[PDB]
Design a protein around this ligand. Structure first.
Ligand SMILES: Nc1ccc2c(=O)[nH][nH]c(=O)c2c1
Ligand SMILES: Nc1ccc2c(=O)[nH][nH]c(=O)c2c1
Ligand SMILES: [Zn+2]
Ligand SMILES: [Zn+2]
Lengths: 372, 372
């Protein structure tokens, strides 16, 4: 296969369905990427992740650079070899989780200095260091290092962050290109910023296209603005990005958010919702989510979802999973996560098929009627 | 298959190898039974438990009678259906864990009254109630309700406990026999008591054989007496039990304890050591156990054990599992437990084959030389 090749097979409105071909595999779009936090997709062996339908997973860079170390993972053979996932891996830049999880962060034009929320150590994450870490991890899809703008953001602050992000995108591009092995085997995605402001989003899209990337992510969303606002921004933001390249909406994963985002031109998604199960007990169904811990499920012999074809819904009842979760058992987390990620992959499949068959709009309508 | 049929295929000294045929399946002996605590073998799907080589698992009654309830499990279709394990299940009586884990236990000739260490509720576990609960769970091998004697024990206290246990064994037998469905589909094992005293052990064995059971467990051991003492007691205790019925050593599982116990006539074992992994990081190897959390394993690419054929040792390195455990990841627990239970099943296989081939004594010798 080629280093990178995105081809759109079908369209309906702003929605697209196709494939991204990479050396390690084919990614069917619209795609949902399960999240591997500390070199692991929570409570699932990689074979189980693949069994659910996933073509690619997202690897958190922040956690990896701290815990085992990027250099260590490289010495061990890379992330794929390390965790046992031989298919594509998109890695974030680590900056977003640095601002959210690290201590005493100091920002500058060079990058971000911070203290680990673990051992209290120090790091200087810059566009160059971020690209290098993703290379050491052996990432297939590398994210440019940017600065996510907090919500709400004033026009001047959103402008300053976006402009810095564009300068960092140029540095990320150059860093990526100077490393021959990485430039020839991996892909680089740029990230659009600009908060909820159209003119800033336009300036960002233009700067990104001018630099040129293999894919374009819509950043700065799913940070507290709400669905109506998120959709409004995507309405004018997605059309600004190059049409022939993948559109990635970072950190967006509620089933309805995904459907609405695909209707607006998004090709890629990632979220912790599926994997962050095992505790609160939320299980997705076509009739909306349910909390398995609720007493009404104690003697419910039916599967998590009546039509889901995952191994969990074939073998275990709501009553059993209810028991496991309330007992704090590891298997409860394993079962809930497998079903949840399976449900998401089934949702992406239904989206891909409906687009290919010119009935996506009808699918979105029917999906919402039932889900809500 | 029959309700119960134990046949010895080969012998070497006191050691025996054979099979126990039951309606739900065949159990190869000597056998190791993984422990399912709250209707689950810690961090493993039942198919994974079977994949390791297990023919039967042990189900804790104490936890089940409290958490989901025996009556509830019966309404849901039984434990097998509930947890997804369709093979034999040996259930303990619940008494041992009542004394170890419950609050304000009050003992009497009728049974034991206690408070749940969960909701602070109350129960009156008696021989009759214990047998009934195991029936409601749909147990294949039912353990008679007894009174484990604390170590150390004075002759008079050991005598009083053993005598009460024998009276309770008679009540367990009668209770089992009066329930037609249970008497026709399940088996009943009696438990020998008597602490470290030979005369008491002899009195216990005689009372048990007089009542008549499908199997005989050696109780009152692995309670703080040490290996030398345990072996000394087994030396004279096992020969007292009927030779043509299985000999079950309860709560014994260290690899060397198992080998020594088989040399003394034991056919069945169970222990939490394999399943209780995922935290401290102990992994069994043919070169003795290792603690994967140790820094020396951070960059060790070799599998947990060089010859173990489990899926974990085929796919992941010590370095990866080291990382997972230290990161507190669920997958670390899943991987460690699968390997550990797989290692135990491989040990039982080596024991079964060496006995069948008349070279068990040599195997025990070679096993210890390397393990220690
Ligand atoms: N919701 C998210 C999630 C992740 C990211 C990111 O990694 N970079 N930049 C972003 O804007 C962003 C937004
Ligand atoms: N080590 C163990 C473990 C369990 C038991 C038991 O369940 N009954 N009786 C016993 O003596 C006993 C000893
Ligand atoms: Zn399912
Ligand atoms: Zn192994």
């Amino acid at each position: 296969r080629p280093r990178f090749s995105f081809s759109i097979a079908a369209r309906e409105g702003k929605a697209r369905t196709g494939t991204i071909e990479m050396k390690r595999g084919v990614i069917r779009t619209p795609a949902f990427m399960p999240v591997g936090t500390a070199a692991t997709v929570k409570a699932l062996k990689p074979e189980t992740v693949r069994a659910t339908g996933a073509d690619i997973i997202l690897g958190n860079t922040y956690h990896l650079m701290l815990r085992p170390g990027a250099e260590r993972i490289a010495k061990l053979g890379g992330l794929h070899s390390f965790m046992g996932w031989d298919r594509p891996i998109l890695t974030d830049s680590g900056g977003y989780q640095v601002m959210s999880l690290s201590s005493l962060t100091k920002q500058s034009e060079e990058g971000v200095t911070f203290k680990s929320h673990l051992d209290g150590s120090r790091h200087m994450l810059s566009p160059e260091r971020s690209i290098e870490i993703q290379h050491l991890l052996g990432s297939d899809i590398v994210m440019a290092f940017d600065e996510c703008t907090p919500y709400p953001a004033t026009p001047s602050r959103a402008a300053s962050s976006m402009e810095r992000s564009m300068r960092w995108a140029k540095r990320s591009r150059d860093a990526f290109d100077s490393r021959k092995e990485q430039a020839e085997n991996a892909a680089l995605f740029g990230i659009q910023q600009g908060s909820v402001f159209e003119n800033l989003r336009q300036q960002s899209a233009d700067a990104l296209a001018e630099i040129g990337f293999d894919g374009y992510a819509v950043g700065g969303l799913a940070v507290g603005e709400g669905q109506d606002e998120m959709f409004r921004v995507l309405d004018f933001s997605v059309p600004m990005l190059p049409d022939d390249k993948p559109h990635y909406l970072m950190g967006v994963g509620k089933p309805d958010d995904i459907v609405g985002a695909v209707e607006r031109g998004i090709d890629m998604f990632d979220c912790v919702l599926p994997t962050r199960s095992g505790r609160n007990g939320q299980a997705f169904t076509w009739d909306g989510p349910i909390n398995i811990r609720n007493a009404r499920f104690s003697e419910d012999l039916k599967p998590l979802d009546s039509e889901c074809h995952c191994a969990v819904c074939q073998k275990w009842s709501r009553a059993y999973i209810h028991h496991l979760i309330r007992a704090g058992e590891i298997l409860g987390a394993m079962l809930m996560t497998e079903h949840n990620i399976a449900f998401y992959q089934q949702l992406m499949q239904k989206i891909r098929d409906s687009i290919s068959e010119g009935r996506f709009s009808q699918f979105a309508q029917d999906f919402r009627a039932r889900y809500f």
